[PDB]
Amino acid sequence: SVAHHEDVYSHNLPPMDEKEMALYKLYRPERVTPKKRSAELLKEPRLNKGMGFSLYERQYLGLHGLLPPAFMTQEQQAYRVITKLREQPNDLARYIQLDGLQDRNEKLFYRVVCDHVKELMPIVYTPTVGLACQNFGYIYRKPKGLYITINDNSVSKIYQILSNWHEEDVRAIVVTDGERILGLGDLGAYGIGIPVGKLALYVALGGVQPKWCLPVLLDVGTNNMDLLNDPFYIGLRHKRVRGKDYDTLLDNFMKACTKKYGQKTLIQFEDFANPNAFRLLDKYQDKYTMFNDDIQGTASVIVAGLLTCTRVTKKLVSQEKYLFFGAGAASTGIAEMIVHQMQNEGISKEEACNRIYLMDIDGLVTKNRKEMNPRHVQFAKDMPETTSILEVIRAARPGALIGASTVRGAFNEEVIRAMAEINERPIIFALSNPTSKAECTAEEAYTFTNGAALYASGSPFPNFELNGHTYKPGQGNNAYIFPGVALGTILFQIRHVDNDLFLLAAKKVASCVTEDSLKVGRVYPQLKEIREISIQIAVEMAKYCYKNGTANLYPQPEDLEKYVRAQVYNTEYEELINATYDWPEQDMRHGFPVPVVRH
Amino acid sequence: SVAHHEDVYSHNLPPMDEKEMALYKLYRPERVTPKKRSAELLKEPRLNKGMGFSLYERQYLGLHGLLPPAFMTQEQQAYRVITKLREQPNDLARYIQLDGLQDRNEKLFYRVVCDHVKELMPIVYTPTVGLACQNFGYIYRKPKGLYITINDNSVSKIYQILSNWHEEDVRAIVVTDGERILGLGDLGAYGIGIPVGKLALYVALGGVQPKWCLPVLLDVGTNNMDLLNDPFYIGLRHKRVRGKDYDTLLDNFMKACTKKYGQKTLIQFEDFANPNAFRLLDKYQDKYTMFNDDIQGTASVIVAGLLTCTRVTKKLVSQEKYLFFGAGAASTGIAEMIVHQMQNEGISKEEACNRIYLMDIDGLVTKNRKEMNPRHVQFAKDMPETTSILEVIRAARPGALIGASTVRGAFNEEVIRAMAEINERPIIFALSNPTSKAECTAEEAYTFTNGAALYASGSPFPNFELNGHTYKPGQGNNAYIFPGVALGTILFQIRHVDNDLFLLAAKKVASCVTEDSLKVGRVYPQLKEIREISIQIAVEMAKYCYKNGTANLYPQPEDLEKYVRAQVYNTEYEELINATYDWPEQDMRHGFPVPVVRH
Amino acid sequence: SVAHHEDVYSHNLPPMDEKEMALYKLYRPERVTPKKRSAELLKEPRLNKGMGFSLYERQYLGLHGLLPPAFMTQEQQAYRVITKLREQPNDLARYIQLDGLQDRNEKLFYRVVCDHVKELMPIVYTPTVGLACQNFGYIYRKPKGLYITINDNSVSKIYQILSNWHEEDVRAIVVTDGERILGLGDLGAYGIGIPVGKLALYVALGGVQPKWCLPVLLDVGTNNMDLLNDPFYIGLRHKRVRGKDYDTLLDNFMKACTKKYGQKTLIQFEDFANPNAFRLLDKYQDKYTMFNDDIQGTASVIVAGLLTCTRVTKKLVSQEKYLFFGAGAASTGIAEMIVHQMQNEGISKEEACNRIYLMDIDGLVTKNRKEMNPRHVQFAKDMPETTSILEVIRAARPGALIGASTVRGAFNEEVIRAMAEINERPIIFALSNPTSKAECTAEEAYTFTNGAALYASGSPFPNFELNGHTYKPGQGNNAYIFPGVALGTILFQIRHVDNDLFLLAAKKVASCVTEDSLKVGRVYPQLKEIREISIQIAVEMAKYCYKNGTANLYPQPEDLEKYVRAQVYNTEYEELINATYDWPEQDMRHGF
Ligand SMILES: NC(=O)c1ccc[n+]([C@@H]2O[C@H](COP(=O)([O-])OP(=O)(O)OC[C@H]3O[C@@H](n4cnc5c(N)ncnc54)[C@H](O)[C@@H]3O)[C@@H](O)[C@H]2O)c1
Ligand SMILES: NC(=O)c1ccc[n+]([C@@H]2O[C@H](COP(=O)([O-])OP(=O)(O)OC[C@H]3O[C@@H](n4cnc5c(N)ncnc54)[C@H](O)[C@@H]3O)[C@@H](O)[C@H]2O)c1
Numbered sequence A, B: 001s002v003a004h005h006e007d008v009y010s011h012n013l014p015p016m017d018e019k020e021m022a023l024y025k026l027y028r029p030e031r032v033t034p035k036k037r038s039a040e041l042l043k044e045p046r047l048n049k050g051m052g053f054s055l056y057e058r059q060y061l062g063l064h065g066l067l068p069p070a071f072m073t074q075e076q077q078a079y080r081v082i083t084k085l086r087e088q089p090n091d092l093a094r095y096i097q098l099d100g101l102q103d104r105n106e107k108l109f110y111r112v113v114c115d116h117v118k119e120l121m122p123i124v125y126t127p128t129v130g131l132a133c134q135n136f137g138y139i140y141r142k143p144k145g146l147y148i149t150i151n152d153n154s155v156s157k158i159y160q161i162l163s164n165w166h167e168e169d170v171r172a173i174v175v176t177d178g179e180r181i182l183g184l185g186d187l188g189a190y191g192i193g194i195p196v197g198k199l200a201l202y203v204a205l206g207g208v209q210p211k212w213c214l215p216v217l218l219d220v221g222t223n224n225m226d227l228l229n230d231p232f233y234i235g236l237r238h239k240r241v242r243g244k245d246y247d248t249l250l251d252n253f254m255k256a257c258t259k260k261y262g263q264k265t266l267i268q269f270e271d272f273a274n275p276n277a278f279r280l281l282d283k284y285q286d287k288y289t290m291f292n293d294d295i296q297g298t299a300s301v302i303v304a305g306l307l308t309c310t311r312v313t314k315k316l317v318s319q320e321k322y323l324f325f326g327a328g329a330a331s332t333g334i335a336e337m338i339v340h341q342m343q344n345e346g347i348s349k350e351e352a353c354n355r356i357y358l359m360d361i362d363g364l365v366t367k368n369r370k371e372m373n374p375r376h377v378q379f380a381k382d383m384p385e386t387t388s389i390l391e392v393i394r395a396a397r398p399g400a401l402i403g404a405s406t407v408r409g410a411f412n413e414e415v416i417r418a419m420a421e422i423n424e425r426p427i428i429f430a431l432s433n434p435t436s437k438a439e440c441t442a443e444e445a446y447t448f449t450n451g452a453a454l455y456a457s458g459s460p461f462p463n464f465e466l467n468g469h470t471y472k473p474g475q476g477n478n479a480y481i482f483p484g485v486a487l488g489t490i491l492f493q494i495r496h497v498d499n500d501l502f503l504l505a506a507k508k509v510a511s512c513v514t515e516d517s518l519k520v521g522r523v524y525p526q527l528k529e530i531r532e533i534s535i536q537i538a539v540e541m542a543k544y545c546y547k548n549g550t551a552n553l554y555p556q557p558e559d560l561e562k563y564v565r566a567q568v569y570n571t572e573y574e575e576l577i578n579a580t581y582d583w584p585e586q587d588m589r590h591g592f593p594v595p596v597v598r599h
Numbered sequence C: 001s002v003a004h005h006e007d008v009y010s011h012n013l014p015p016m017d018e019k020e021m022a023l024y025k026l027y028r029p030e031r032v033t034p035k036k037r038s039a040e041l042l043k044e045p046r047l048n049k050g051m052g053f054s055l056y057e058r059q060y061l062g063l064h065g066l067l068p069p070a071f072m073t074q075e076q077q078a079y080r081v082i083t084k085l086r087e088q089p090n091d092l093a094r095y096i097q098l099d100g101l102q103d104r105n106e107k108l109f110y111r112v113v114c115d116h117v118k119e120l121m122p123i124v125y126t127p128t129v130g131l132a133c134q135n136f137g138y139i140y141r142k143p144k145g146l147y148i149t150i151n152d153n154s155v156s157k158i159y160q161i162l163s164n165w166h167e168e169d170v171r172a173i174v175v176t177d178g179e180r181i182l183g184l185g186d187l188g189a190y191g192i193g194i195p196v197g198k199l200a201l202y203v204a205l206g207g208v209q210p211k212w213c214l215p216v217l218l219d220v221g222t223n224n225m226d227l228l229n230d231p232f233y234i235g236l237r238h239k240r241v242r243g244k245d246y247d248t249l250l251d252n253f254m255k256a257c258t259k260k261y262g263q264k265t266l267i268q269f270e271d272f273a274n275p276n277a278f279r280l281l282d283k284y285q286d287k288y289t290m291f292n293d294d295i296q297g298t299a300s301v302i303v304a305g306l307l308t309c310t311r312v313t314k315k316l317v318s319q320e321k322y323l324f325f326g327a328g329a330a331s332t333g334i335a336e337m338i339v340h341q342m343q344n345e346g347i348s349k350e351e352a353c354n355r356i357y358l359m360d361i362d363g364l365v366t367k368n369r370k371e372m373n374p375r376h377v378q379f380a381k382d383m384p385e386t387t388s389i390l391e392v393i394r395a396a397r398p399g400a401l402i403g404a405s406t407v408r409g410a411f412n413e414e415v416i417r418a419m420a421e422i423n424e425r426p427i428i429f430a431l432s433n434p435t436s437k438a439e440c441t442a443e444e445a446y447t448f449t450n451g452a453a454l455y456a457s458g459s460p461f462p463n464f465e466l467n468g469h470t471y472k473p474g475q476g477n478n479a480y481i482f483p484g485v486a487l488g489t490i491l492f493q494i495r496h497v498d499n500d501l502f503l504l505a506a507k508k509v510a511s512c513v514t515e516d517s518l519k520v521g522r523v524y525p526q527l528k529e530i531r532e533i534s535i536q537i538a539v540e541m542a543k544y545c546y547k548n549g550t551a552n553l554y555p556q557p558e559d560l561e562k563y564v565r566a567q568v569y570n571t572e573y574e575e576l577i578n579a580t581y582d583w584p585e586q587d588m589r590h591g592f
């Protein structure tokens, strides 16, 4: 136990100024002792260290004899997981393994996932998670999410469901109705893995506290005819409900969630069907602490890449011209975001939209159009209708070409050749996923540009080498934005997340691209730097929000960066046994303070 | 179970407009099912109904056989408590009984205390609680409060203590170092009953949720020499610590409390030694959600009585002159508050203070003074020094005489006679407690004024009858203010409680005095109306705070009064068994949805 | 933590030989770490030490800040308890404070009761408990008993009620229907305090573990019209059911208890109407591990009193003649127990029964009787019909006179004088309770005898000095027997408790009466010696039961006494935190 003149768990600390010491004590995480013992404790992911538990810890907590007689450090444990991970037959087996790990030892999980983020991020989420939902069907696991259906339609019924969740301090919810699982379509009740995976990244990459996370899946039926014929499907068996009832369910859901955990609860929508996703985002954006990653996340990730490219094309975003091959969700969102930015660059919403050209399945988006999207309207151009990329490239001679259209190789040798001709360093983004859907590859983009192009894709491509120079193409991964945006929104209790905040994030991501990463064609920082980036974004979001009064955390912390670093998740094993401390010897005595005569 | 087209616990409801229905569902309290069974449940005050549990409830929750085979309604139970209460030998025995009831059946407790508020308020708190601390010494009871000592001096040590408290959603803390227990002095560690009692009133009179309340006692030693000689005293055995250490303890305490439950946590100081109480209030008032009832509560209660008297003396507070016999905490605070009010009445801080005269043990407070309190300075008058009340009454001919000085009968027949002569209806307040310390009695004040005086006292006096007219003198009980101020501060998360808010409260209390109560000499509403008054004050505090942006609850509720009524405590027994509800018959079926051939 | 070559909690142990150490480790109580923390732990009487918890314990168990900042020893806490106790206005108030203590800190409760046994026994049980039930009505307390009614009449319905109890290892149950609470009658559902009190003595006096105890009250209604008319009564508001339903409820109760806790579960009946007491005992005696203290306990304690008298009358129990004034449940029981004792001494059931003279309200018991009790018959004498005791004392000139009949001062100077005349040291027992109803006081017994009488009563009498010689008459308190009989039955899983065992208990109590206590005229051991007496009784019971194969505990423990002492309750606080110990330095290392 600690001396009477010392504080608890304040050993071996860095030299500190009296004022510095107080701030540290005020911000630092405090020890939390669990109520469970023995097997009940070993089965709690958040507490279980497995063989990482020392012998004293085991005897004290009633764990001794329940674990094999071997003792391990967390590094050794992480080693064992990594080894076994790489011996798995395929990516799906690794997914199943990691999911099991998250349910067994949460500290080890995030330890492993954070140490090999590049190697495992596509397993934990990216493309493997959806493949798992589709191929395994119902996956055995501990209750790591909630299923709320169209038959639980009311504030009370959903409130009771949330009440069955084991944590009371929920501050971040990721929801999906599983109608549009990224690159697979309507998977219904099988989509529960998506919210789980996303939240896993919030923690791994954002530093968000795991106890604050809740995966939710809304089941209003499914339109995937296979599932409805599948005798194993475990979701509601009928096509999707879409009337007012669907609208009411979501309304009651947002209400129930905030009624239970408070209005500041961050609710993020995932994999909704495009149309719904945009509507829903528009309906709740200013009424709740909500945001849709597929839409705003994408927009922000790309703009951050374009903003980083700015440092090479020596041309400001407002001094550039963009040509989007594809006019769907991704492209449309990225455009509107590029516009906002331009206006914040001392320009009008006239010369802004006039600098962006969109091409859809029916060629260029001109004005003589019939039945076009209201969002495309402000981008339509008063020029000749055409379906040729090259022709559009020649007419407007854009500064950057962005691909967000299903079409593979839609960016042929000629198109790449043209872009180089008109620009010393042409920006070419092949976003379509997976790589087999890419408008063009890294190799193609570099070679057909003699190595001058600025390339970025949605999926990972191998590093290319041209004329003695090496190139390491990047990826416009949403994971660069949402983690940080989520962290900052939570720690400072931002009432609403607007485009400006996403823009701030993009600018932050761009600012973190090193000069070395830029000398290798990388317009995106390294994935392993997302935790530090997230912290930086959180601090930046704070300054900006306390300035315009939208941050609810009162009062504004003295030192923002220090407060944030003290709030983020720590993969290291913590002490679970109360810290003891002495009192002045005289006051710790057992017995009558003043003598009496015995009866 | 409920039908598939119905909602849970939505039976027999008042006719509602679709829009009205939604608001109701959004605000209404939701059912909460407990995790404990059998004896563990019976021992939980917040869940235990005793024989109020029906037979079905008993069998379901594993309670059957643990309670006698008799079934009771809550009214019958309340009846039994009341009967037994009145058969007790003295007030102390009743206190002990009620304390035991609070630890056995919380619903029944507040049911009983609320139904007979006039008869039991002085038992639960007012004067009996302090007598109990002093006479019983250590009182056996369940752990209903926390002891934090000078030997637990650090954010972490206090954090760990708060962590041992069974509730995580604490929103209201009442603390005391027990140095100045009202009318008894330094009682040290024995003062734990004070915070407990005060919080009990928050709930009984304010409608504050009991689960949000936490009684705390700071033990820095004691100067009461008897206790230090008492072989039974259970507090730290040494005189009070007062250096920087005392200052640090309180600093770490406010930090630890907000670090644990959040910055919005209402922390109210109780029974601190006058000097400390004022300093501490000044140091934290603008840094935390804090307030000191003895100081601000008093000030506000009295001003509310003076404001109600305004409706008779047809003279505004700023069109009146006050003479305080006594210049201590109570009087000084009430003065400064009367000033604030006057300034809000279109006047300056010159003509304001000039309308208030203060008398202390050394006579009138003039200017030729030596070593006087800095707060008295602005009230000192440039007139002749004197010790005669009558003489001061004659010179300034005040409109109201307020007594807040130990001296019994300090308001003699002549003094009362004088006040009547100079004023058609003279305001005379005898605040000193108990009645045996009153500057004068109700009988005295009425008779010696032919029944024209406006009297109010700190302690309860019997109703008097003069010349065929009946009078029911009131009491300037703090309980009229703090409950409501606490409720509103909590529900709307007001960042800081300022004088304006207390003034708003006083004006509210005054506004609730009926015309009948005014025709009987009552300048204070009935004690049984404090719950409704508290709600009214909460709503008023909301409007005012959303207007100047100090209310943190976001967003401002649509209907303030409805939101508040849905938040207040309800003494009625609630259901503890989950509500069940049907799903569409087809979706509730057990079995393969699509036939398969058996293996 | 302990060294790798040391066992846990084995420091400062007495010198022991290899084998002695082994048997000590095999028998010793092991530490048991609780699962509750903070307020939940403080609210468990069996774990709560209150302020006796040290600062470290408080920080470890999450209790710090929940208790005041003082730290006490158990002794210092007992002191505070006794002080408050003696300051109480009356015994009833002392009862209420003790009941609250049992529900607050169990170890302290027993430390206090065990230290001041003679002072508190009558508060915890004896006479005050019945008064508390009658006067207070429903008393506020933690759930410390179970109510089973005529409406929960099925093996399953009772099983579910027993399943609501907080301990699974129940081994002793004391049940009552409250019809005949000693000295007060029918108090219905208010009678739950009796079982609670009886079990409290099981622990305090017998050493029985508290967690094994389960108090129960069967509510089948009440005939106490005042309770039925009282709007504050909390029991079934109707009279007592007695049909096949009652007997069915009792049969289901016995089945449910043994199905739930095992056939070995000891079930003791208390304060039942005499007819039900006897009928039920006769019915379950050899079917379950059961007994009724009022019947057998009484019978046993009194015989132990007589046996002790033998040492002074140089006359064997069989070489004596007894005269019972009053032939109710008490006398008839003692008679039959005495008989059983005579037979085990070599004689037959002939001289035995011919050595006992019974009298009821209608004078002596003459064979010319009409409508008499079946149990009585075998004691009925073929002599003249008289009503005067003197006329009976003078006729059969008995060596002992035993009073068990409401009548106060039934033994007048002429009655006693006649005994002193016929016997050098006449045996005079006035059992009727309370004192104000005693057949005759001690001052009377000794005076009208010239300090030559061997006297005892059911209620206490101050010490009496006569001619320089002091006298300290004893009480025939059932507490000398049931605690030990219970301890022994439980620890060794004795299938059935019969006369032989109670007699055995009787002989052990008698043998513990010192010579000095005998010179002062006290024929019963000191009350403070009951715990040791209980332990010796269990040992003796074990020896007897293993020999006749009625002890189910397998195998017979090696050292009966060491085993017993290792099992009895210990009032001292125990460590609640796990003992830690090292492994070889190399086997604790973390890492590859
Ligand atoms: N950060 C990222 O890297 C990221 C984020 C989100 C989506 N994406 C990828 O972007 C792509 C598009 O996503 P989406 O949600 O906008 O789909 P979408 O259906 O909403 O949009 C597709 C658009 O491309 C047009 N199009 C289709 N076939 C075409 C053809 N042959 N020629 C020309 N135009 C054609 C369509 O008319 C439509 O405007 C996907 O491959 C998706 O995986 C990447
Ligand atoms: N709402 C209420 O009804 C209410 C609230 C708080 C306090 N009180 C009562 O007010 C009284 C004063 O409280 P306090 O905290 O200000 O005590 P205090 O010690 O702070 O003030 C007492 C003042 O009276 C003066 N005084 C004393 N003896 C005097 C005498 N003989 N003649 C003239 N002046 C004299 C002192 O100099 C001092 O200025 C107490 O009796 C207290 O119970 C009533």
Ligand SMILES: NC(=O)c1ccc[n+]([C@@H]2O[C@H](COP(=O)([O-])OP(=O)(O)OC[C@H]3O[C@@H](n4cnc5c(N)ncnc54)[C@H](O)[C@@H]3O)[C@@H](O)[C@H]2O)c1
Pocket (backbone or CB within 6 Å): C274, C294, C298, C301, C325, C326, C327, C328, C329, C330, C331, C359, C360, C361, C362, C363, C403, C404, C405, C406, C407, C431, C432, C433, C434, C437, C457, C458, C459, C476, C477, C478
């Ligand atoms: N351990 C003890 O010390 C102890 C144990 C059991 C009983 N007792 C006492 O023994 C007494 C009787 O106990 P019980 O359970 O047998 O009650 P009981 O009703 O069964 O016995 C009463 C007997 O006394 C007879 N009787 C009554 N009034 C009489 C009179 N005026 N003259 C002659 N005979 C009369 C009755 O006919 C009957 O046989 C009680 O006072 C009881 O407290 C003491």
